[PDB]
Give the backbone structure.
Amino acid sequence: KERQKVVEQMEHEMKEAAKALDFERAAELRDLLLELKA
Amino acid sequence: DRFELVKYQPQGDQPKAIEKLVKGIQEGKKHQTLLGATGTGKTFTVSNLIKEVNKPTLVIAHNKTLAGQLYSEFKEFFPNNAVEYFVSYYDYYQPEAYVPQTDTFIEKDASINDEIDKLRHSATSALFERRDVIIIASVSCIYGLGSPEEYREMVVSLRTEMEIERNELLRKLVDIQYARNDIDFQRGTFRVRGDVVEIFPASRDEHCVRVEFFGDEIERIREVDALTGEILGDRDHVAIFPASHFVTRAEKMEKAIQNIEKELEEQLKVMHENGKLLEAQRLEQRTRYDLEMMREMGFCSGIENYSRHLTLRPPGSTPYTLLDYFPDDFMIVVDESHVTIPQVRGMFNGDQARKQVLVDHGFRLPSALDNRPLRFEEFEKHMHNIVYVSATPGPYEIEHTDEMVEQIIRPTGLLDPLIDVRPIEGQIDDLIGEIQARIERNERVLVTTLTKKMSEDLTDYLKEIGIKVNYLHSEIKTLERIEIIRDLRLGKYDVLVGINLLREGLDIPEVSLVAILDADKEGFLRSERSLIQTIGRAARNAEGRVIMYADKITKSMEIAINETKRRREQQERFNEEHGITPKTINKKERQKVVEQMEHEMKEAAKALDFERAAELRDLL
DNA sequence: TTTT
Ligand SMILES: Nc1ncnc2c1ncn2[C@@H]1O[C@H](COP(=O)(O)OP(=O)(O)O)[C@@H](O)[C@H]1O
């Protein structure tokens, strides 16, 4: 669970930056998230 | 099977609250009420309660957002125990109903949300596997579900070194609603490669069970990642539960179709006898098709209307609900009991009204009413110990509690707000200056009005003046309300105006003043409950204040103001005596073009196309 | 705001 917990948390935080309109931070997270999936 | 509570430490009067609640259970009290002021850390006290008393526990919430909000919070609290989520799997649902005033028929329309159905299976299955279980539920927990005894019974139990032929395992898998699918392996499915069966339990969508055979002997049972095939752990026992909460065996089903014809014949006699000819033509037309389909498929749409018949159970019978999947020795926590209890009660009556007009007009057999939520007397019967959480307990809660348990000390010592009463004359003006001042301290304002009329005007007034404002129309969906609240938080609006501020998620630390117009008008909106909760929204700010505009002081106002003032006094007594400092925890053409670019922005956020979202933002 |  521990790896996916981190992923699920990065995920939440990334939706959260989108909602603040901090899209810059959201992309950064997005790109990071993509690498771990890989 | 202990609960393992996991960053805070009881502060304020939390220890004392927990102490009384637990003792209260120990004394075997059936009803207790945790009278927590808003922002006092109620969900954490409840958490502590749960740990000490160590029962499986049901947490009921009035809306799904709050439910989800607690669930998140409890998964963090008890990372090692089974926190579950029991809500409706309907992402959309337009019920079937009939409007006699226009002779038109609403077809049932509905999209099931896979994630939720999974979380509901996760929930019922958990109650059978372990005792360390918290479920957060909607009023879905009083709606119907197959016999817990039939479900517990239809479990396929595997253990290593068990004797069992592979194909025998398959039979059992189908009899409990699993679906052989080799190409699209999803939850609810099993797949077969020679000596390896892989079941994707209905309560998971991430992990599955691999059952490796050698002759008619289970060699090993593994847990594996379904997409990859990566091994997570050996098991020497596995319980696989039915992939659906309501399975009718073909034998039960044949007898049911029987009973439905008999009911049907009886009902037709009575309508024809009463010259309800049109209605019988329809009853029979519809019921007969439904029946044909049940002989051919053991399925028809609206099959749930026939549920009681598929249980072979006698009329008027209490449904089986989640309440029934629990141990006898279990605890219920009712969050926002003033709203949630009413809601739990109103379910049976709202349900039975809709169906009676359907039955009176012959769309459904009388037996269809046996497919219902629980009556509150029935709910009551599942009350072993119950804790009610509310800053404003309802009448039921008060009546059944011997002594309240009060919890008034906020963690950062944040005080209950100061209240000004001022007259109705000058109202808008007085208010206007109180807003301007607030805009100057980069702080926000909530104002409640009694009416659509006054809300609309005052909003247009505010905008006319170059103040940034939003009107919370009662027609606004919470999804939308949250976009608006956020915006208020961020500063895209400086004031919110509405009728009900007790609508969800209106608790925001940047709000430093709450104006209550027409405070003396009593009614629903200015009752003691409303006043208090409304005052409630100003207590997330070190400077919070409330202006009530009123020409006299009503019973409601009195109790509201008095309570605020008692609390604030003790919260200052405490603050002093403990050295704490209150810190805050934290134009028609353009209207249409901005609305369309906001959509295209929200859209690109969801696609995670955050670069396009920002082009659109910088556009707006 | 909630359910089938
Ligand atoms: N014992 C504690 N120590 C520190 N912080 C706490 C404690 N209990 C709660 N909090 C936090 O302080 C805030 C107030 O709690 P909240 O959940 O808003 O209470 P309520 O359910 O009464 O509104 C929350 O953000 C909460 O997570």
